[PDB]
């Protein structure tokens, strides 16, 4: 099975790992470690930024890939904003500082 651009989970904007073949492959922690071992940094980023999360990253990367321009515009993983919500909805206040 293989997938390039499929659906996404509602809760966390991640490629639906269902639909039994149309779903995206899982890139667990060990895979991230293997990437960390090499100097590959943009590979890991585009993995967990463009190809999974970043409601804008997927769209921008796709609109670029067709223009012959292979360049990612990394944003913010939606899972992390959801984590900020789930932590801040508690009696915990998490925030971000300067540019």
């Amino acid at each position: 099975h293989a997938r390039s651009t499929g659906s996404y989970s509602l809760v966390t904007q991640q490629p639906l790992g269902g639909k039994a073949q149309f779903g995206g492959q899982r890139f667990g922690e060990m895979e991230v470690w293997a990437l960390e071992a090499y100097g590959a940094a943009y590979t890991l980023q585009e993995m967990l930024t463009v190809k999974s999360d970043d409601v804008n990253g997927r769209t921008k990367m796709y609109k670029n890939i067709v223009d012959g321009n292979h360049q990612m515009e990394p944003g913010m993983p939606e899972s992390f904003n959801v984590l900020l919500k789930e932590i801040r909805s508690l009696g915990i206040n998490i925030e971000l500082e300067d540019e």
Binding site: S7, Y8, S9, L10, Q13, L16, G17, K63
Partner: protein, 471 residues
């Protein structure tokens, strides 16, 4: 144990039960307190002036007869015409005779005819609040006139109470303390405006409530005692019969609602059944309290069970449909037909399917999917909101194609098209809207638009745009 259900289950074992003695014993105490607070209103001219306004408006179609009175301690509609002029036998004997010597022992017989008319608690509470607002109004003036002399002029509190206790009406006490030559005396001429005019809202009360400033304090002084008696009795009542609420609440286990929620929503109905109970009828309290307890549990369930709240009526109707389908399992052998309950029920036929269609419950997204793996329902949930990128690219391409094509037409047609449609502009414009700032109106634009849409309908200038249509 830990769980807060244990704190409660053994918090009631303290106050011993009350049967055959307790009930009738402390109900008399309840009534003996409300009798103290009731006669407090018996002497309140504002209550008379307020009763006249709400009385004559009953004969003018505003307020119902049985909506202002629960009865008379003296369901008969004929017992009314006989107690609306016989009670005035003391109405005008003490009011216009102040012109106030013999008007001191003739106030009880005028107030006696005022305790034979049981008003509905709705207006009764307004009367209690009326006396409360009168006390607060009178008192505001005292807490004004006091701190204007003590906290400002530095006078002893006792020299204030000594000169104030007894008058509380005129200025004969204030201007008399000027000759005391005390250290606070020389500071009484500056506040002679915040204390003199202060009686304008204090002394005037006397001509409204027809009573001295001090009597207004006596009334509430005893009224508070009466209401305290009532409170202290009813709390013990509900504490005693508390166990009954649990006995009733244990009949609703899997009601989409925790146990303590049920027992509490039932305690509310227990309190309600208490406040509206008369020990005179003889009927035991266990029979009466059960109605309000069980109803405040049932309706509460109907209101807090479903995550999607449903009006009470629908809950009743659905449960009835379920009952009929239950008692017919043994008749049909397995289960009734869909259009069968239509007749057994009072409702019509076609409403059954909708009533049952909406009767679904939400499934927790954490419900593990098949294979029993950690995979849950919330993992297979898609997102049909975001448009796929394969279409976003088409949008960004059509934008440019339309831009180039429109830039191929004339200037007039260009702005007219970008106007009639919301192209690269906030909010497209109507016909006369375009004509408003294009110097020729109402049909000029109607011709320009058709001409441009035709110059684009022609090929060799539409191929690019025409490809974007695929059907």
């Amino acid at each position: 144990t830990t769980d807060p259900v244990r704190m409660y289950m053994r918090e009631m074992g303290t106050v011993e039960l009350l049967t055959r003695e307790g009930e009738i014993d402390i109900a008399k105490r309840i009534e003996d307190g409300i009798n103290q607070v009731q006669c407090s209103v018996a002497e309140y001219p504002e209550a008379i002036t307020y009763l006249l306004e709400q009385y004559n408006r009953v004969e003018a179609e505003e307020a119902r007869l049985s909506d202002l009175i629960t009865g008379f301690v003296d369901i008969d509609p004929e017992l009314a015409r006989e107690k609306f002029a016989e009670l005035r036998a003391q109405y005008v004997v003490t009011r216009d005779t102040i012109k106030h010597a013999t008007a001191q022992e003739e106030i009880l017989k005028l107030s006696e005819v005022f305790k034979q008319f049981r008003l509905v608690p709705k207006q009764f509470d307004y009367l209690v609040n009326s006396m409360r607002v009168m006390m607060d109004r009178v008192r505001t003036q005292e807490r004004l006139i006091m701190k204007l002399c003590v906290e400002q002029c530095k006078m002893p509190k006792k020299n204030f109470i000594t000169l104030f206790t007894g008058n509380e009406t005129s200025d004969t006490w204030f201007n008399a303390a000027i000759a005391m030559n005390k250290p606070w005396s020389e500071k009484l001429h500056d506040v002679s405006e915040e204390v003199h005019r202060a009686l304008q809202k204090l002394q005037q009360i006397e001509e409204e409530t027809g009573l001295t400033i001090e009597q207004v304090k006596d009334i509430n002084r005893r009224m508070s005692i009466g209401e305290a008696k009532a409170r202290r009795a009813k709390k013990e009542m509900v504490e005693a019969n508390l166990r009954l609420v649990i006995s009733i609440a244990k009949k609703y286990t899997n009601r989409g609602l925790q146990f303590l929620d049920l027992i509490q929503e039932g305690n509310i109905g227990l309190m309600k059944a208490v406040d509206k109970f008369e020990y005179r009828r003889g009927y035991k309290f266990s029979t009466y309290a059960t109605w309000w307890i069980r109803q405040a549990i049932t309706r509460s369930i109907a209101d807090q069970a479903r995550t999607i709240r449903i009006p009470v009526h629908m809950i009743e109707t659905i449960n009835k449909l379920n009952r009929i389908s239950r008692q017919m399992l043994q008749e049909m052998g397995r289960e009734p037909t869909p259009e069968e309950l239509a007749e057994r029920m009072l409702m019509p036929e076609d409403k059954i399917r909708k009533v049952l269609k909406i009767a679904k419950e939400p499934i927790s997204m954490e419900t593990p999917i098949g294979d029993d793996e950690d995979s849950h329902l919330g993992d297979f949930i898609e997102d049909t909101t975001l448009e796929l990128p394969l279409d976003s690219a088409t949008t960004e391409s059509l934008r440019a194609a339309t831009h180039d094509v429109l830039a191929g037409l004339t200037a007039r047609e260009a702005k007219v098209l970008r106007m009639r449609f919301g192209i690269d502009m906030n909010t497209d414009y109507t016909l006369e809207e375009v004509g408003k700032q294009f110097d020729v109106t109402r049909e000029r634009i109607r011709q320009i638009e058709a001409k441009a849409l035709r110059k684009l309908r022609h090929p060799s200038r539409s191929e690019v745009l025409r490809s974007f249509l695929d059907d």
